[PDB]
Amino acid sequence: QEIIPKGYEIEHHQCGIALNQLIPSDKKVFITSTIPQITERFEDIESNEVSFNMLFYDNKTPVNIAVSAEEISDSRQLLKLVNKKLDVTSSTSTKLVDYINASKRYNPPLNVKVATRLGHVKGYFIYPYQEVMKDSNVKLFSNDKGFQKLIDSFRSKGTLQGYSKKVFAQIKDLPMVMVMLYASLGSVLLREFGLQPFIVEISGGKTFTLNLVSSVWGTSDLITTWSIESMASFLNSFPMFKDDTRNTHPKFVTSATYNFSSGKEWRNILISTRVVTLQDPPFTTLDKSFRENYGTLGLAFIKQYESKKDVYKNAFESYQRYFNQKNEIMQRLGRAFALLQVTGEVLNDIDGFEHDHFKIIEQAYDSMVKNNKTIDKPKQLLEELLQYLDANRNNIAGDGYSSVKNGDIKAIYKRDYLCILGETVKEKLTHELQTITGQWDKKGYLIKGEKDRLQKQVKHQTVKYRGFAIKQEVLKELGFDFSN
Amino acid sequence: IESNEVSFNMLFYDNKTPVNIAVSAEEISDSRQLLKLVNKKLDVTSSTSTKLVDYINASKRYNPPLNVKVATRLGHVKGYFIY
Amino acid sequence: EIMQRLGRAFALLQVTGEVLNDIDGFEHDHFKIIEQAYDSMVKNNKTIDKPKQLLEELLQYLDANRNNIAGDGYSSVKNGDIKAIYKRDYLCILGETVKEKLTHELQTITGQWDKKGYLIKGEKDRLQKQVKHQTVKYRGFAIKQEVLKELGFDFSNSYNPNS
Amino acid sequence: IESNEVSFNMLFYDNKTPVNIAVSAEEISDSRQLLKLVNKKLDVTSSTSTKLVDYINASKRYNPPLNVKVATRLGHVKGYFIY
């Protein structure tokens, strides 16, 4: 039992318990029938501010309520807890504040350091697994219940090796799902390598691959359907899975992704169904496997890294400097590939998860440089222009072409090249004309002019036009043949 | 049963006619808010609000009200299914 | 594909009918009532199959613009742009017209068209075939005559006037 | 040195652990605002806020704090160049 502060009395009548104040002459002045007992104080190690739990009995029923410091120490605010069964009024608020203060002095609450997010916060790394948390003497406060249900989903289950033979062995070398799993594992390492967030997406089983990569740390409830910012800040170092890209508005998503890419602050990978892409496509039984064998491989991975941190660090530094060598946009993503590959190198060293990390990762790298369009905007745009011209031959002049009788001339067909008139290239590129035509030149697409000018002077019949001469070779590579 | 917060029904007589009005905890336990029920036929003023709050508190102590658990929606709420 | 996303909902309505059958005076056939409307949905609802929907619309459009279609039995397109090349085996809709229709959904819908078997792919494992007519080479999506007819179209320009 | 306004650092012990917190002049010299530091481990209430404000004033009188001129930007401010 706890002590009663000097000056206070506690009566036990039929009406129920009663905290009276003792005023000498001793006269008794009722304070409350709801004796507050402040059991714990919580210190958010991010904010360094503090809160409390108030416990009191509403006539046989314990009532624990989370309360701020002000609510407990400010009469006008303390009065607001009447809605939660606290016996207090504008008349007794001050006496109850004073009693609370004294009880706090004479019965110190338990001090609990508290964290509201996962991952790296200040000096600690907060794990969402009871087993790990009970050893570290920090608690995981999450008022918002969405994240709480997210944490109950982190709970591990099943054995380990059973995940490496029932789940993992089914897909040691399926490259797309395997790189997605690298994302879900190496998300933890961004803060370790100084790398900012990025994305790994699959598009074109999809939901199935996402549900499967969820089993690296727990249930398929880690997944969500497309806020993003708060969830990212909470997972912090842990990967985010977002599902059903299809069901939602495109204005919303791309904005959400640009927002996520920015940095409370977080540093993790977004895995969906600064982007690494997996567009190739890679059941009933392996689903039972990863549903019975929840997330054990994840914490194993973390422990593996922990073992030889500063070794994997130098390995990543090597992969980083090298991937920055091998197209401009793919070199922008050099650190991300470095990271996913060090993730694979870490996974290789785990016992029952041996596999070829170099080949899966180069396999998907080349899958990207081949299949992903946006890496090469100058070429893409060029193709779009040619496609357009492919359908507008009544406005093309040149060898074998009927003279353009009405309107504008869009290109001059010569055998060695197609000279797309400057005006059409402007109509296509607008303000990006200078840079894209520059890239076309840097890429060797065009037959330059005399005076260090991108546009060649090309003759047909009785006119000399000025336009960008695109070599027959490029036309053919892109699948076009303006030949008669 | 969703919020675990509480409200009350106040009964009073406006010269032979009963008046039952639903009132929040704050309205009954804070003089400034109790004063707002004057619009609903309650005899109270800025002068008497405190004494009436204290009387309400004491009356509540010695004639406890009936406790009713309550739901504002149908279906599954927390552990019950409300029909 | 979309009907499998609604799998749990149909499962549920089916368990609802299975529950209702067991009530005292409420006997009825739930399996037939439920399969009847499943198939009624896949038949009558267009939006389940957006790729076919879009395709038909495009064909509808081309049916009204043959003065801009070239190919077998067609007068050369003299004014404006070329929208398709009619070969006996297929209608090769030029890439630009498919873009003008699908805009940002081009890749996904053409992918569906291929996965659905609508088109005669090109040599280099590319969705757009190179189509030769007279002496000119266009690049477009070749839609098999079978699909044209299934959707109710006949892009032949050769039919004796006397009929 | 730009504003000529002033702020303070308060040091107190939360049972063996020093706590230094930056505080405005108003926070320290106005009971209503001083009360807001309860969130930062300060033992104060609406009942004791006035006495603690007065104690702070007196302690400030008899143990003057160190005066530090301060700048929040680099470069030329008023007469100095802050590196």
mmCIF file of N, CA, C and O in Angstrom, chain A residues 204 206-207 244 246 281 373 380 383-384 387-388 390-395 401 406 428 476-484, chain C residues 1 5 77-83 94-97 99-100 106-107 112 115 124 126 128 130 135-141:
data_model
loop_
_atom_site.group_PDB
_atom_site.id
_atom_site.type_symbol
_atom_site.label_atom_id
_atom_site.label_comp_id
_atom_site.label_asym_id
_atom_site.label_seq_id
_atom_site.Cartn_x
_atom_site.Cartn_y
_atom_site.Cartn_z
ATOM 1 N N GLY A 204 3.130 -4.197 -63.886
ATOM 2 C CA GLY A 204 2.915 -4.896 -65.137
ATOM 3 C C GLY A 204 1.461 -5.263 -65.352
ATOM 4 O O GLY A 204 0.912 -6.101 -64.636
ATOM 5 N N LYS A 206 2.012 -10.163 -58.045
ATOM 6 C CA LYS A 206 2.327 -8.818 -57.575
ATOM 7 C C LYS A 206 1.926 -8.611 -56.118
ATOM 8 O O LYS A 206 2.798 -8.517 -55.238
ATOM 9 N N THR A 207 0.621 -8.533 -55.845
ATOM 10 C CA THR A 207 0.169 -8.545 -54.459
ATOM 11 C C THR A 207 0.761 -9.738 -53.719
ATOM 12 O O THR A 207 1.063 -9.649 -52.523
ATOM 13 N N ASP A 244 -1.872 -2.519 -53.752
ATOM 14 C CA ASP A 244 -3.015 -2.101 -54.557
ATOM 15 C C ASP A 244 -2.798 -0.695 -55.108
ATOM 16 O O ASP A 244 -3.627 0.204 -54.940
ATOM 17 N N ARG A 246 -3.237 0.002 -57.944
ATOM 18 C CA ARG A 246 -4.208 0.170 -59.017
ATOM 19 C C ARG A 246 -5.457 0.904 -58.548
ATOM 20 O O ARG A 246 -6.043 1.688 -59.303
ATOM 21 N N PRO A 281 7.419 -10.251 -64.656
ATOM 22 C CA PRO A 281 6.592 -10.937 -63.666
ATOM 23 C C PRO A 281 7.225 -12.254 -63.246
ATOM 24 O O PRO A 281 7.652 -13.041 -64.100
ATOM 25 N N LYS A 373 11.729 2.662 -69.341
ATOM 26 C CA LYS A 373 11.766 3.688 -70.376
ATOM 27 C C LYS A 373 12.364 5.001 -69.884
ATOM 28 O O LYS A 373 13.138 5.638 -70.609
ATOM 29 N N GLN A 380 13.607 8.318 -75.639
ATOM 30 C CA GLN A 380 12.158 8.161 -75.573
ATOM 31 C C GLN A 380 11.465 9.253 -76.384
ATOM 32 O O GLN A 380 10.728 8.970 -77.337
ATOM 33 N N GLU A 383 11.825 8.829 -80.045
ATOM 34 C CA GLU A 383 10.934 7.808 -80.576
ATOM 35 C C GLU A 383 9.526 8.362 -80.728
ATOM 36 O O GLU A 383 8.912 8.232 -81.796
ATOM 37 N N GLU A 384 9.029 9.060 -79.701
ATOM 38 C CA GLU A 384 7.687 9.621 -79.782
ATOM 39 C C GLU A 384 7.555 10.516 -81.004
ATOM 40 O O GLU A 384 6.535 10.483 -81.702
ATOM 41 N N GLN A 387 7.460 8.238 -84.227
ATOM 42 C CA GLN A 387 6.128 7.652 -84.306
ATOM 43 C C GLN A 387 5.146 8.654 -84.895
ATOM 44 O O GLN A 387 4.409 8.344 -85.840
ATOM 45 N N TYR A 388 5.161 9.888 -84.383
ATOM 46 C CA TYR A 388 4.252 10.905 -84.897
ATOM 47 C C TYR A 388 4.464 11.088 -86.395
ATOM 48 O O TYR A 388 3.524 10.972 -87.192
ATOM 49 N N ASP A 390 5.657 9.076 -88.417
ATOM 50 C CA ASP A 390 5.300 7.872 -89.155
ATOM 51 C C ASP A 390 3.880 7.963 -89.701
ATOM 52 O O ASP A 390 3.583 7.382 -90.753
ATOM 53 N N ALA A 391 3.002 8.703 -89.022
ATOM 54 C CA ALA A 391 1.604 8.802 -89.418
ATOM 55 C C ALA A 391 1.285 10.065 -90.205
ATOM 56 O O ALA A 391 0.124 10.270 -90.573
ATOM 57 N N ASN A 392 2.274 10.907 -90.481
ATOM 58 C CA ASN A 392 2.051 12.199 -91.124
ATOM 59 C C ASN A 392 2.958 12.342 -92.330
ATOM 60 O O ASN A 392 3.702 13.312 -92.487
ATOM 61 N N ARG A 393 2.886 11.353 -93.218
ATOM 62 C CA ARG A 393 3.728 11.328 -94.403
ATOM 63 C C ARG A 393 3.251 12.290 -95.482
ATOM 64 O O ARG A 393 4.062 12.714 -96.313
ATOM 65 N N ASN A 394 1.965 12.652 -95.482
ATOM 66 C CA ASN A 394 1.449 13.693 -96.363
ATOM 67 C C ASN A 394 1.993 15.075 -96.023
ATOM 68 O O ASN A 394 1.660 16.045 -96.716
ATOM 69 N N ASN A 395 2.788 15.194 -94.961
ATOM 70 C CA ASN A 395 3.447 16.444 -94.618
ATOM 71 C C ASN A 395 4.958 16.267 -94.567
ATOM 72 O O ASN A 395 5.666 17.116 -94.016
ATOM 73 N N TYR A 401 8.541 10.999 -102.237
ATOM 74 C CA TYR A 401 7.358 11.548 -101.591
ATOM 75 C C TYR A 401 6.647 12.513 -102.528
ATOM 76 O O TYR A 401 7.287 13.294 -103.239
ATOM 77 N N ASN A 406 -0.525 21.291 -99.222
ATOM 78 C CA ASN A 406 -1.197 22.150 -98.262
ATOM 79 C C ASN A 406 -0.461 22.124 -96.934
ATOM 80 O O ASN A 406 -0.002 21.068 -96.487
ATOM 81 N N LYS A 428 7.654 19.749 -80.451
ATOM 82 C CA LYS A 428 7.707 18.587 -79.570
ATOM 83 C C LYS A 428 8.393 18.887 -78.236
ATOM 84 O O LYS A 428 7.878 18.513 -77.178
ATOM 85 N N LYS A 476 16.311 3.107 -87.883
ATOM 86 C CA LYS A 476 16.143 1.663 -87.982
ATOM 87 C C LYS A 476 16.215 1.011 -86.609
ATOM 88 O O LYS A 476 15.397 0.140 -86.288
ATOM 89 N N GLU A 477 17.175 1.428 -85.774
ATOM 90 C CA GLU A 477 17.262 0.899 -84.417
ATOM 91 C C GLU A 477 15.942 1.068 -83.674
ATOM 92 O O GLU A 477 15.508 0.167 -82.948
ATOM 93 N N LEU A 478 15.296 2.220 -83.838
ATOM 94 C CA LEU A 478 14.040 2.488 -83.148
ATOM 95 C C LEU A 478 12.835 1.887 -83.858
ATOM 96 O O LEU A 478 11.711 2.041 -83.372
ATOM 97 N N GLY A 479 13.035 1.223 -84.990
ATOM 98 C CA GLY A 479 11.978 0.478 -85.637
ATOM 99 C C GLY A 479 11.258 1.184 -86.761
ATOM 100 O O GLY A 479 10.129 0.795 -87.081
ATOM 101 N N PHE A 480 11.867 2.190 -87.374
ATOM 102 C CA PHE A 480 11.192 2.983 -88.387
ATOM 103 C C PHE A 480 11.933 2.913 -89.710
ATOM 104 O O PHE A 480 13.150 2.710 -89.753
ATOM 105 N N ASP A 481 11.174 3.089 -90.790
ATOM 106 C CA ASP A 481 11.717 3.003 -92.144
ATOM 107 C C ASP A 481 10.870 3.925 -93.022
ATOM 108 O O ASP A 481 9.853 3.510 -93.582
ATOM 109 N N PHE A 482 11.298 5.178 -93.125
ATOM 110 C CA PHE A 482 10.602 6.165 -93.937
ATOM 111 C C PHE A 482 10.930 6.016 -95.422
ATOM 112 O O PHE A 482 10.651 6.922 -96.213
ATOM 113 N N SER A 483 11.502 4.868 -95.783
ATOM 114 C CA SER A 483 11.896 4.576 -97.155
ATOM 115 C C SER A 483 10.710 4.270 -98.059
ATOM 116 O O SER A 483 9.723 3.662 -97.637
ATOM 117 N N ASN A 484 10.817 4.703 -99.312
ATOM 118 C CA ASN A 484 9.854 4.352 -100.349
ATOM 119 C C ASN A 484 10.421 3.198 -101.180
ATOM 120 O O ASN A 484 9.951 2.906 -102.280
ATOM 121 N N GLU C 1 -9.608 -10.521 -64.687
ATOM 122 C CA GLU C 1 -8.762 -10.170 -63.552
ATOM 123 C C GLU C 1 -9.542 -9.460 -62.453
ATOM 124 O O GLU C 1 -9.365 -9.766 -61.268
ATOM 125 N N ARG C 5 -10.520 -10.096 -57.886
ATOM 126 C CA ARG C 5 -10.419 -9.181 -56.751
ATOM 127 C C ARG C 5 -11.690 -9.173 -55.917
ATOM 128 O O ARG C 5 -11.621 -9.026 -54.691
ATOM 129 N N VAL C 77 -4.046 7.313 -98.759
ATOM 130 C CA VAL C 77 -4.473 8.450 -97.945
ATOM 131 C C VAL C 77 -3.813 9.709 -98.503
ATOM 132 O O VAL C 77 -2.595 9.886 -98.403
ATOM 133 N N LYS C 78 -4.627 10.590 -99.077
ATOM 134 C CA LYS C 78 -4.170 11.754 -99.827
ATOM 135 C C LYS C 78 -4.074 13.004 -98.970
ATOM 136 O O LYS C 78 -3.159 13.813 -99.160
ATOM 137 N N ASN C 79 -5.002 13.180 -98.035
ATOM 138 C CA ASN C 79 -5.006 14.320 -97.134
ATOM 139 C C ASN C 79 -4.809 13.845 -95.703
ATOM 140 O O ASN C 79 -5.399 12.847 -95.282
ATOM 141 N N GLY C 80 -3.972 14.566 -94.963
ATOM 142 C CA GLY C 80 -3.872 14.352 -93.536
ATOM 143 C C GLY C 80 -3.055 13.126 -93.163
ATOM 144 O O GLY C 80 -2.107 12.737 -93.848
ATOM 145 N N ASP C 81 -3.457 12.501 -92.064
ATOM 146 C CA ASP C 81 -2.645 11.504 -91.384
ATOM 147 C C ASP C 81 -3.131 10.096 -91.702
ATOM 148 O O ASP C 81 -4.253 9.885 -92.169
ATOM 149 N N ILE C 82 -2.252 9.131 -91.452
ATOM 150 C CA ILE C 82 -2.528 7.720 -91.692
ATOM 151 C C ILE C 82 -2.797 7.069 -90.344
ATOM 152 O O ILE C 82 -1.963 7.142 -89.432
ATOM 153 N N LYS C 83 -3.961 6.426 -90.214
ATOM 154 C CA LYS C 83 -4.394 5.868 -88.939
ATOM 155 C C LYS C 83 -4.310 4.355 -88.855
ATOM 156 O O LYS C 83 -4.220 3.825 -87.744
ATOM 157 N N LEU C 94 -1.669 2.426 -86.463
ATOM 158 C CA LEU C 94 -0.381 3.074 -86.256
ATOM 159 C C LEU C 94 -0.224 3.501 -84.799
ATOM 160 O O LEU C 94 -1.193 3.851 -84.119
ATOM 161 N N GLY C 95 1.025 3.469 -84.327
ATOM 162 C CA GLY C 95 1.300 3.795 -82.937
ATOM 163 C C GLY C 95 0.720 5.125 -82.496
ATOM 164 O O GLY C 95 0.231 5.254 -81.371
ATOM 165 N N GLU C 96 0.778 6.137 -83.364
ATOM 166 C CA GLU C 96 0.340 7.472 -82.968
ATOM 167 C C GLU C 96 -1.150 7.496 -82.652
ATOM 168 O O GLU C 96 -1.582 8.173 -81.712
ATOM 169 N N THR C 97 -1.957 6.769 -83.428
ATOM 170 C CA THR C 97 -3.394 6.717 -83.166
ATOM 171 C C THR C 97 -3.680 6.007 -81.844
ATOM 172 O O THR C 97 -4.556 6.427 -81.067
ATOM 173 N N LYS C 99 -1.672 6.005 -79.328
ATOM 174 C CA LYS C 99 -1.326 6.962 -78.287
ATOM 175 C C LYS C 99 -2.446 7.978 -78.107
ATOM 176 O O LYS C 99 -2.915 8.202 -76.991
ATOM 177 N N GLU C 100 -2.920 8.569 -79.206
ATOM 178 C CA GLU C 100 -4.009 9.537 -79.123
ATOM 179 C C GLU C 100 -5.210 8.971 -78.379
ATOM 180 O O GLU C 100 -5.988 9.730 -77.788
ATOM 181 N N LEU C 106 -1.198 3.631 -72.278
ATOM 182 C CA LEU C 106 -0.834 2.901 -73.487
ATOM 183 C C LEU C 106 -0.160 1.577 -73.162
ATOM 184 O O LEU C 106 -0.582 0.519 -73.646
ATOM 185 N N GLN C 107 0.915 1.618 -72.375
ATOM 186 C CA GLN C 107 1.675 0.402 -72.101
ATOM 187 C C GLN C 107 0.804 -0.657 -71.442
ATOM 188 O O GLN C 107 0.802 -1.817 -71.866
ATOM 189 N N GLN C 112 -2.173 -5.722 -71.993
ATOM 190 C CA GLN C 112 -3.357 -6.564 -71.865
ATOM 191 C C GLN C 112 -3.769 -7.137 -73.217
ATOM 192 O O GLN C 112 -4.092 -8.327 -73.325
ATOM 193 N N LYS C 115 -1.275 -10.023 -73.851
ATOM 194 C CA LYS C 115 -1.612 -11.115 -72.945
ATOM 195 C C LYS C 115 -2.968 -11.721 -73.287
ATOM 196 O O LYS C 115 -3.209 -12.902 -73.013
ATOM 197 N N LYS C 124 11.307 -8.417 -83.263
ATOM 198 C CA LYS C 124 12.217 -8.340 -82.117
ATOM 199 C C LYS C 124 11.505 -8.431 -80.772
ATOM 200 O O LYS C 124 11.907 -7.769 -79.813
ATOM 201 N N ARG C 126 8.670 -7.225 -79.970
ATOM 202 C CA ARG C 126 8.099 -5.903 -79.758
ATOM 203 C C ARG C 126 6.622 -5.932 -80.123
ATOM 204 O O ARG C 126 6.224 -6.580 -81.098
ATOM 205 N N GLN C 128 4.698 -3.696 -81.411
ATOM 206 C CA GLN C 128 4.341 -3.080 -82.681
ATOM 207 C C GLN C 128 5.052 -3.807 -83.815
ATOM 208 O O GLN C 128 6.282 -3.930 -83.817
ATOM 209 N N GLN C 130 6.114 -4.213 -87.829
ATOM 210 C CA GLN C 130 6.378 -3.471 -89.051
ATOM 211 C C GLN C 130 5.484 -4.038 -90.148
ATOM 212 O O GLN C 130 5.530 -5.241 -90.434
ATOM 213 N N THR C 135 5.004 0.022 -101.183
ATOM 214 C CA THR C 135 6.441 0.002 -100.917
ATOM 215 C C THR C 135 6.809 0.747 -99.636
ATOM 216 O O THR C 135 7.983 1.076 -99.439
ATOM 217 N N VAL C 136 5.849 0.997 -98.745
ATOM 218 C CA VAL C 136 6.105 1.794 -97.551
ATOM 219 C C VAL C 136 5.958 0.900 -96.327
ATOM 220 O O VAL C 136 5.143 -0.033 -96.295
ATOM 221 N N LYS C 137 6.758 1.209 -95.308
ATOM 222 C CA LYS C 137 6.816 0.452 -94.061
ATOM 223 C C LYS C 137 6.336 1.303 -92.896
ATOM 224 O O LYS C 137 7.001 2.271 -92.513
ATOM 225 N N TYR C 138 5.187 0.947 -92.339
ATOM 226 C CA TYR C 138 4.658 1.580 -91.141
ATOM 227 C C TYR C 138 4.939 0.698 -89.929
ATOM 228 O O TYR C 138 5.259 -0.483 -90.057
ATOM 229 N N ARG C 139 4.826 1.288 -88.741
ATOM 230 C CA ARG C 139 4.987 0.555 -87.488
ATOM 231 C C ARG C 139 3.725 0.730 -86.656
ATOM 232 O O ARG C 139 3.395 1.852 -86.252
ATOM 233 N N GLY C 140 3.020 -0.369 -86.399
ATOM 234 C CA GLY C 140 1.794 -0.263 -85.630
ATOM 235 C C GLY C 140 1.378 -1.575 -85.003
ATOM 236 O O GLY C 140 1.999 -2.617 -85.212
ATOM 237 N N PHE C 141 0.296 -1.499 -84.225
ATOM 238 C CA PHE C 141 -0.251 -2.665 -83.539
ATOM 239 C C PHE C 141 -1.154 -3.442 -84.488
ATOM 240 O O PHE C 141 -2.180 -2.923 -84.936
#
